Design a protein around this ligand. Structure first.
Ligand SMILES: CCCCCCCCCCCCCCCCCC(=O)OC[C@H](COP(=O)([O-])OCC(O)COP(=O)([O-])OC[C@@H](COC(=O)CCCCCCCCCCCCCCCCC)OC(=O)CCCCCCCCCCCCCCCCC)OC(=O)CCCCCCCCCCCCCCCCC
Ligand SMILES: CCCCCCCCCCCCCCCCCC(=O)OC[C@H](COP(=O)([O-])OCC(O)COP(=O)([O-])OC[C@@H](COC(=O)CCCCCCCCCCCCCCCCC)OC(=O)CCCCCCCCCCCCCCCCC)OC(=O)CCCCCCCCCCCCCCCCC
Ligand SMILES: CCCCCCCCCCCCCCCCCC(=O)OC[C@H](COP(=O)([O-])OCC(O)COP(=O)([O-])OC[C@@H](COC(=O)CCCCCCCCCCCCCCCCC)OC(=O)CCCCCCCCCCCCCCCCC)OC(=O)CCCCCCCCCCCCCCCCC
Ligand SMILES: CCCCCCCCCCCCCCCCCC(=O)OC[C@H](COP(=O)([O-])OCC(O)COP(=O)([O-])OC[C@@H](COC(=O)CCCCCCCCCCCCCCCCC)OC(=O)CCCCCCCCCCCCCCCCC)OC(=O)CCCCCCCCCCCCCCCCC
Ligand SMILES: CCCCCCCCCCCCCCCCCC(=O)OC[C@H](COP(=O)([O-])OCC(O)COP(=O)([O-])OC[C@@H](COC(=O)CCCCCCCCCCCCCCCCC)OC(=O)CCCCCCCCCCCCCCCCC)OC(=O)CCCCCCCCCCCCCCCCC
Ligand SMILES: CCCCCCCCCCCCCCCCCC(=O)OC[C@H](COP(=O)([O-])OCC[N+](C)(C)C)OC(=O)CCCCCCCCCCCCCCCCC
Ligand SMILES: CCCCCCCC/C=C/CCCCCCCC(=O)OC[C@H](COP(=O)(O)OCCN)OC(=O)CCCCCCC/C=C/CCCCCCCC
Ligand SMILES: CCCCCCCCCCCCO[C@@H]1O[C@H](CO)[C@@H](O[C@H]2O[C@H](CO)[C@@H](O)[C@H](O)[C@H]2O)[C@H](O)[C@H]1O
Lengths: 57, 53, 103, 80, 62, 139, 135, 383
């Protein structure tokens, strides 16, 4: 009725702070893993060159 | 309305964890904070370089 | 989530506390209780007269004698004890009658 | 100040001198209970709990109760 | 722990809080019971018990 | 503003406690008395210093109510008792205990006589118990 | 199966005696649930007014008990021993006489170890009754 | 789970059929254990067979060493099949509870009957053989899962709190592993991220140094009877035997890929015996396979290569983390619009409360300025 309640009350703030920090850490890790992938596609000039070769030019 | 804090505190006290201070975990988590935009740019550049390598 | 102190009722928590948290202390306490009631649970009439009364023993009414008288009367009446038996008096009934006629 | 071992708490200043000097005091907005507020006597204008009941009156009430406690048996003695 | 609370500045302020009103009443009782004992136990008509030598606690505890 | 209490402090000053980092610091440099953000926290200096927060009327931009799906967790168990329910139970129990203790205190200090009086006008002188009954062979 | 081991098995409704309980909790919380009411190991509170109220009350009821239940035994013993050795002998006196005797007992209490010793030591040649008066 | 009259009727009706089934299972399990024991004694390492002694460095108390006193029989498939091992494990649990009940009966004579009535009214400590139909078995499994839910969080909190209060991780990867190990079951933990915690804790507390209270919590979470607990080397022996059998079966399954061919119900049972899949979660085959594969990955390549599993304390915490449900939150957010201290409104504010409101209210700056100016003037006048 008295002792364990008081010590739980004492515990509450530090646990709240640590869990807030943990959530911020999770969000930070989520953000840090984001990279824009630029893709590379076959240049059309080689297609234009193969087209010309096929013509026997 | 903050169930996680409640459950952790109750469990810690019930298993003889009376102390209310956690210096080591705080030391691990104290400097945590959301990064600035410039820091995000630097980290993204590092990740792009790593992926290219 | 489950905790003994928050979820269990008081008797259950008491048993758990003194069986899986402080069993040795409970054992020692029970040992000491047995010792106390085995060796420190008696007081003679003289001890009561010397120290057993707040302001002192009231000899002018002698409550200890009245208490013992009630005790012995109750025992005699309930157990049907013949206090005139030779073992209690050390003499035969006829000798007792002779003594009564003499005195 | 103190009343025996009971010391009156004092609020710590939070403003710096520069910021404090720029504060404009307007006691017209203050409650009537706290005007000309003095840290050494903050309850000078505080209302009485019971109108007309002075501290001396309560002290005297206790004194009279003590006198009754000691003198009632002198006027209405009772047998053992 | 004596951290804070209402503290009257002087006697006249004890009537500004019910708890201190009760306190000053109790102080009145405490201090006023002594004058009453002075008057009662130093009275002219107070007489020692004639039978005070018949019995005393000193002989009882001895 | 009301007269209600706030998050308990234990009479401690959060600017010098061992867990001070857990208490947010405001612009004025006074750490909060609670995990919450407090704008008007102060420190009072008796024999010992202590932090105090005065409730006040302040408007905060209220984010709209979310859906129940994203904050409700239906993991309740038969043994589980919420803090609100525990407070209710303990309040009722302590109310009845207080009444009982009050009656006990009144009887003990104003009605119960002390045992073994010299005059015999008040209190019992004691008596014997567990005496044999219906056992003639015992004597 | 007969009785539950869990506190969650309620025996009454949530609203049973809500009003009186709330008044009781209001009485408890108003002075105690405050920042400056920091206790020392739950026994010594920080609020001054708690001391100011509880010290007098504790003293008052303890003193009433002592005066009317504990010291009364010594007073009655003195009355009985000095005036016959029996309760009926004391009751043969009037209320005024008993008042005088009891107040003399109070005098003896207040002297204790510093008062004159003629209150219990009979000087030689004194004409008052001695210890063998009633024997 | 709490006792009920319906369960009491169920167990009283199936009492004697249950006992007969338990006896038959006892014969079968004795045969299986005899095969396994003969193989262990014949082909086991010298330390394992001789029961080498490992003492703690502080009080020199013997306890089972995971490296020396546990041995994975890689070639057990020749003599004993996977199903037989599962049967033996289930029988070991049932036999432990039955043995405790029989011991109580022998100790207290006929005075245990009312306690037997309390016993049959709950499925927590009755054997699985007492259920003769699917619904009864489902209720029994629900009771077991409820006990696991009740007991596991205390074990996890004990481990985490003691370590965090008395030690910290060495490097960032260990920090991430330790933090992610104790996440609630609503999120998926990556075994590769969490594995380093095993070595980190091996530095702190190996299975040979496990404390008696932590052992009691673990045995509660594993549905192992704990009364009378006695010395920690009895229930510790039970834990070691159970997980040694589990690791033998795990090696068999991993090597032979039996889980892929394993049917849905058998797969669910396999996960359940590893404390990975509660039945109340109503998991499908995809989720069960995901959890089983995560368990195998947590065991790691070294398990197959050398039969060495990670630290048993951390392994138990990892698997029991699936019974660490999110903290319950019931009630609409509108309930936050109410007030908690309306019953105090009638009392108002006393002089001290009014002073505090005045000094620390919106006019606090003006009061501070006035007070400081007055004090400065008085100090100047004094000088
Ligand atoms: C779904 C149903 C809905 C129904 C809706 C109904 C709504 C309408 C109301 C219904 C009617 C009222 C119901 C009852 C209300 C009771 C009061 C109340 O509300 O309390 C709050 C609360 C309400 O319930 P809840 O909050 O919903 O749920 C409770 C929790 O679940 C669990 O609680 P917990 O475990 O946390 O705590 C329980 C208990 C801890 O548990 C126990 O105590 C239970 C076990 C106690 C055993 C004690 C006896 C042991 C004896 C030795 C063993 C003997 C063995 C014999 C074997 C056989 C021999 C042949 O805690 C306490 O002890 C603290 C509280 C104590 C209360 C104060 C009691 C004194 C008040 C006095 C006031 C009056 C003063 C005098 C006035 C005079 C005026 C002139 O009730 C309790 O806490 C229960 C208290 C029970 C105490 C029992 C004590 C018994 C003592 C006397 C025994 C006499 C024996 C005689 C033998 C003779 C032989 C010759
Ligand atoms: C009539 C007089 C009675 C005396 C008073 C008794 C008072 C009650 C105390 C308890 C008595 C025992 C109760 C029955 C237990 C069931 C049998 C048994 O051992 O189960 C195996 C099981 C073994 O447990 P474990 O942890 O796996 O053992 C690790 C070993 O490494 C396991 O070795 P492993 O890993 O190599 O695997 C071997 C396993 C492999 O086997 C299998 O896998 C097949 C299954 C075999 C076991 C089946 C057990 C079935 C249990 C249920 C029975 C049905 C109940 C039906 C109930 C309803 C009836 C209507 O086979 C075993 O379990 C063999 C274990 C060793 C044999 C133990 C028996 C020795 C005593 C009997 C001989 C006495 C001869 C007297 C000669 C007199 C000369 C003057 O026993 C237990 O669960 C332990 C008992 C749990 C309760 C403990 C209570 C405290 C005990 C303190 C005793 C202190 C000394 C006595 C004085 C006390 C004064 C305060
Ligand atoms: C036919 C059947 C088949 C054949 C037989 C087969 C064999 C059967 C036997 C084996 C069965 C094993 C499994 C049993 C499981 C069930 C155990 C159990 O009890 O569960 C709780 C069980 C309910 O279980 P559940 O609802 O299923 O919940 C289970 C959960 O999982 C909750 O689980 P949990 O883990 O939370 O609960 C555990 C809890 C278990 O405990 C409890 O739950 C406590 C139960 C009692 C609570 C009582 C509350 C009510 C009190 C009322 C007081 C009186 C009121 C007024 C009455 C007025 C009457 C006029 O705590 C403990 O485990 C503590 C253990 C403590 C051990 C103590 C050891 C002491 C050793 C001493 C020191 C030695 C040192 C060495 C010295 C060496 C020297 C050389 O509790 C009850 O049902 C309560 C029954 C209350 C009965 C009425 C009150 C007492 C009546 C006494 C009458 C006396 C008459 C004679 C008087 C004569 C006067 C002269
Ligand atoms: C607010 C006021 C309310 C009222 C308050 C009441 C007043 C209380 C005041 C004082 C209370 C504290 C006293 C503490 C004393 C010191 C304790 C201590 O040193 O403990 C050391 C230590 C601590 O225990 P632990 O094993 O470490 O774990 C305890 C945890 O609670 C284990 O927890 P766990 O979570 O690990 O396990 C949970 C679960 C786990 O579940 C299981 O393990 C499965 C089920 C297991 C069933 C039991 C298996 C037993 C196997 C054999 C045991 C050895 C037998 C030895 C020979 C027999 C000796 C008689 O276990 C259970 O549920 C256990 C169920 C037990 C139910 C019985 C509890 C007592 C209720 C009262 C019934 C008796 C009343 C008699 C008096 C009245 C007569 C008219 O105890 C032991 O080593 C256990 C030895 C057991 C020896 C047998 C009992 C000896 C005592 C004499 C029995 C007399 C029987 C009379 C029959 C009727 C005659 C007419
Ligand atoms: C209602 C019934 C009442 C019953 C009363 C009787 C007492 C209770 C009975 C039993 C109760 C159940 C639970 C008991 C405790 C359980 C302990 C436990 O969990 O052990 C697990 C453990 C199993 O684990 P493990 O891994 O297999 O082996 C342990 C590891 O080695 C562990 O490895 P470690 O690294 O820990 O190694 C250390 C380990 C190494 O030890 C062991 O573990 C080995 C087993 C113990 C060996 C003990 C014998 C040592 C050599 C004795 C030499 C004596 C020579 C004297 C010659 C005299 C010539 C004139 O421990 C020691 O070093 C301790 C040594 C013992 C020191 C004794 C000091 C006593 C000082 C005396 C002071 C003065 C007293 C008063 C004055 C007297 C004179 C005027 O069990 C055992 O090892 C054996 C357990 C035996 C249990 C006791 C059996 C009771 C039988 C009772 C028969 C009599 C009944 C009378 C009834 C009367 C009417 C009612
Ligand atoms: C005016 C005079 C003033 C004198 C003041 C003197 C000091 C008094 C101080 C009192 C307060 C402090 C007390 C502290 C505690 C003291 C403890 C103490 O010495 O008690 C010893 C005493 C010794 O008991 P005992 O006195 O009955 O000894 C019996 C010995 N014979 C039969 C030879 C006479 O302990 C008890 O009283 C408790 C006994 C019961 C509990 C223990 C039972 C188990 C015993 C185990 C061994 C024997 C059985 C075999 C093994 C078990 C088999 C199941
Ligand atoms: C188990 C009994 C078997 C024999 C049948 C006896 C029937 C006697 C008639 C009873 C009529 C009144 C019943 C009232 C409802 C009782 C409900 C009950 O048991 O509640 C227990 C409840 C405690 O509740 P919790 O611990 O929170 O947990 C409950 C849920 N798990 O206990 C109470 O509040 C006390 C209620 C006492 C009711 C009266 C019980 C009388 C039992 C008598 C048994 C002996 C035989 C009687 C024969 C009578 C022949 C005419
Ligand atoms: C009341 C007591 C109750 C006891 C209950 C438990 C009984 C268990 C009995 C198990 C019997 C096993 O039987 C035993 O097995 C071992 C191990 O394979 C055999 O052991 C044999 O092979 C091993 C291994 O190569 C050799 O080290 C050993 O020298 C040789 O004898 C024994 O020859 C056989 O007798």
């Amino acid at each position: 009725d008295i002792m364990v309640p008081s010590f739980v009350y004492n515990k509450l703030p530090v646990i709240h702070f640590l869990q807030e920090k943990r959530a911020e850490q999770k969000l930070r890790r989520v953000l840090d893993e984001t990279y824009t992938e630029w893709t590379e596609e076959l240049d059309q000039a080689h297609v234009t060159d193969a087209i010309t070769r096929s013509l026997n030019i | 309305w903050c169930p996680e804090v409640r459950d952790r505190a109750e469990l810690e006290v019930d298993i003889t964890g009376w102390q209310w201070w956690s210096p080591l975990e705080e030391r691990r988590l104290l400097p945590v904070r959301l990064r600035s935009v410039n820091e995000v740019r630097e980290i993204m550049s590092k990740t792009q370089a790593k992926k290219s390598a | 989530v489950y905790t003994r102190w928050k979820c269990d009722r008081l008797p259950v928590f008491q048993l758990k506390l003194f069986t899986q948290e402080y069993p040795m202390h409970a054992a020692v306490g029970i040992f000491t209780i047995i010792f106390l009631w085995k060796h420190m649970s008696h007081c003679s009439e003289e001890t009561e007269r010397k120290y057993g009364w707040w302001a002192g023993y009231p000899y002018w009414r002698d409550p200890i004698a009245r208490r013992n008288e009630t005790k012995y009367k109750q025992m005699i009446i309930n157990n049907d004890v013949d206090i005139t038996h030779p073992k209690w008096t050390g003499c035969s009934v006829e000798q007792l009658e002779e003594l009564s006629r003499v005195v | 100040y103190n009343m025996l071992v009971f010391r009156d708490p004092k609020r710590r200043p939070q403003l710096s001198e520069e910021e404090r000097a720029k504060v404009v005091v307007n006691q017209a907005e203050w409650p009537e209970e706290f005007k000309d507020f003095d840290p050494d006597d903050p309850y000078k204008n505080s209302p009485e709990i019971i109108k007309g009941m002075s501290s001396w009156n309560l002290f005297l009430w206790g004194v009279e109760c003590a006198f009754i406690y000691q003198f009632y048996e002198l006027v209405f003695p009772k047998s053992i | 722990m004596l951290l804070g609370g209402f503290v009257p500045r002087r006697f006249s302020q004890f009537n500004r809080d019910p708890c201190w009103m009760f306190f000053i009443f109790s102080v009145g009782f405490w201090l006023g019971e002594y004058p009453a004992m002075m008057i009662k136990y130093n009275a002219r008509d107070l007489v020692y018990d004639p039978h005070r030598y018949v019995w005393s606690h000193h002989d009882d505890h001895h | 503003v009301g007269n209600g209490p706030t998050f308990s402090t234990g009479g401690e000053c959060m600017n010098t406690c061992d867990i001070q980092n857990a208490f947010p610091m405001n612009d004025r440099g006074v750490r909060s008395s609670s995990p919450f953000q407090e704008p008007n926290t102060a420190i009072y200096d008796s024999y010992l210093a202590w932090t105090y927060f005065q409730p006040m009327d302040v408007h905060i931009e209220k984010l709209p109510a979310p859906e129940a799906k994203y904050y409700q967790r239906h993991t309740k168990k038969p043994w589980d008792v919420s803090s609100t329910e525990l407070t209710e139970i303990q309040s009722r129990k302590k109310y009845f205990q207080t009444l009982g203790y009050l009656v006990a205190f009144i009887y003990l200090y104003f009605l119960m006589p002390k045992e073994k009086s010299f005059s015999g006008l008040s209190g019992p002188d004691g008596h014997w118990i567990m005496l044999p009954k219906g056992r003639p062979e015992l004597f | 199966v007969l009785f539950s081991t869990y506190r969650s098995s309620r025996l009454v409704s949530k609203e049973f005696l809500h009003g009186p309980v709330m008044r009781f909790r209001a009485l408890g919380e108003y002075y105690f649930q405050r920042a400056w009411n920091g206790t020392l190991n739950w026994a010594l509170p920080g609020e001054y007014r708690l001391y100011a109220v509880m010290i007098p009350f504790i003293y008052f009821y303890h003193r009433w008990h002592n005066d009317h239940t504990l010291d009364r035994d010594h007073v009655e013993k003195a009355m009985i021993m000095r005036w016959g050795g029996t309760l009926e002998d004391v009751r043969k006196l009037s209320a005024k006489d008993q008042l005088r005797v009891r107040c003399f007992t109070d005098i003896e209490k207040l002297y204790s170890a510093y008062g004159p010793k003629d209150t219990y030591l009979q000087p030689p040649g004194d004409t008052l009754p001695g210890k063998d008066f009633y024997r | 789970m709490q006792g009920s009259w319906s369960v009491l009727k169920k167990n009283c009706s199936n009492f004697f059929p249950g006992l007969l089934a338990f006896a038959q299972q006892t014969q079968e399990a004795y045969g299986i254990w005899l095969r396994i024991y003969n193989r262990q004694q014949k082909y086991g390492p010298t330390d394992f067979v001789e029961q080498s002694e490992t003492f703690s460095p502080d009080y020199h108390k013997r306890f089972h060493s995971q490296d020396k006193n546990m041995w994975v029989d890689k070639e057990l498939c020749t003599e004993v099949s996977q199903k037989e091992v599962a049967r033996l494990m289930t029988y070991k649990l049932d036999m432990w509870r039955m043995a405790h009940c029989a011991g109580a009966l022998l100790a207290t004579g006929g005075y245990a009957i009312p306690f037997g009535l309390f016993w049959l009214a709950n499925d927590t400590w009755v054997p699985s053989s007492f259920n003769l139909t699917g619904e009864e078995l489902r209720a029994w499994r629900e009771a077991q899962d409820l006990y696991r839910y009740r007991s596991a969080p205390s074990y996890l909190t004990d481990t985490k709190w003691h370590f965090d209060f008395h030690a910290y991780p060495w490097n960032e990867t260990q920090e991430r592993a330790w933090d992610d190990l104790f996440e609630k079951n609503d999120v998926r933990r990556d075994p590769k991220v969490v594995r380093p915690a095993a070595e980190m804790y091996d530095g702190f507390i190996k299975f040979e140094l496990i404390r008696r209270k932590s052992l009691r919590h673990l045995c509660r979470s594993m549905n192992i009877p704990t009364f009378p607990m006695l010395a920690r080397l009895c229930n510790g022996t039970r834990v070691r035997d159970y997980w040694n059998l589990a690791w033998c079966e795990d090696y068999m399954v991993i090597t032979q890929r039996l889980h892929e061919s394993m049917t849905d119900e058998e797969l669910y049972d396999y996960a359940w015996r590893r404390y990975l899949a509660p039945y109340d979660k109503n998991l499908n085959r995809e989720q069960l396979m995901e959890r089983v594969e995560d368990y195998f990955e947590f065991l790691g390549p070294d398990f197959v290569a050398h039969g060495k599993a990670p630290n048993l304390v951390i392994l138990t915490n990892y698997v029991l983390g699936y019974y660490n449900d999110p903290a319950y939150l019931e009630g609409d957010i509108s309930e936050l619009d109410k007030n908690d201290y309306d019953h105090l409104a009638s009392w108002g504010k006393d002089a001290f409360l009014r002073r505090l409101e005045f000094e620390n209210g919106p006019l606090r700056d003006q009061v501070e300025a006035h007070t400081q100016r007055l004090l400065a003037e008085r100090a100047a006048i004094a000088k």
